[PDB]
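step 3/5: co-fold with 5-fluoranylpyridin-2-amine
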Amino acid sequence: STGSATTTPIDSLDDAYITPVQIGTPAQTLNLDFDTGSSDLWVFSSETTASEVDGQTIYTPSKSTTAKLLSGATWSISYGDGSSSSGDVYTDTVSVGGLTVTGQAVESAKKVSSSFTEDSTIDGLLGLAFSTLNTVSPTQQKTFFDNAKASLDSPVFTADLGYHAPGTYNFGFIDTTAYTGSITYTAVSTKQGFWEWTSTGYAVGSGTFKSTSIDGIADTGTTLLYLPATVVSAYWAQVSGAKSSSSVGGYVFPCSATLPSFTFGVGSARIVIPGDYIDFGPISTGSSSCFGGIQSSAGIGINIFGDVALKAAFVVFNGATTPTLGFASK
Ligand SMILES: Nc1ccc(F)cn1
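step 4/5: write tokens
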């Protein structure tokens, strides 16, 4: 089998991407944030504290003839932005773009933190990291991809995120029309539960490529590109007026600037992020100071190839016996 679904930026800055997902019988369609950095499929629900729901579409398990409560199971997750959610668990039928998993664990939120409530466009998350990170207790549950993998034509899922435009998540096949050149595959460590790989280096704009190993994760659920302080300083040094702002929480730059591209290495291959992809707009409404899309990982403990990086590429999440990651230009 295969599946294919369109993924769309939630706003004019590509702050995140949502993909429609059918849950239950009859289907209930929720727009979920596909997150290769986490491993829980959780949704806003009929059980979510009312004051914490503000415009999201909810899953109502009592209206699904295929929903079954997973007895005694609870879940609780926290993310790198300080947000969190928790609740109980059902199993139900989940479909993405034509691909169906029966008995998928659907984590129903009883509580969500303020940043989830305040985002009316995201009805939940669909985790696509490794199932070892799933938070369900006392019996850990598998991701949608892990459950579907054996049925797929090929044990892969691909991310083709758009810049200011729709894109595609495919399951079970590689669309060879969706990229230029070839796909370069690179090794993955699953030991932290992430799609953790090692970039071979970087360049800023038209500058010299620096060969240097940068261990990091391919994370569709993180908006920005988080890299070592040395790399980030080298990038922003090329932008007149750019500075690291403690008050704002990262590098800012004049909104009047035209940004240089940023290249990262995948083996001997190169992915070029156009400069415009690095502009995240005014720091506050009407400001002429703009927030940068490349930020230091120093206060994080891991480098993160988030959407800024991934949207410049066609990315293969290869769940073969030995998982790997593939990147192509597009
Ligand atoms: N980096 C993040 C932040 C929030 C979330 F839900 C997932 N990933």
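step 5/5: annotate
The chain has four helices and 24 strands.
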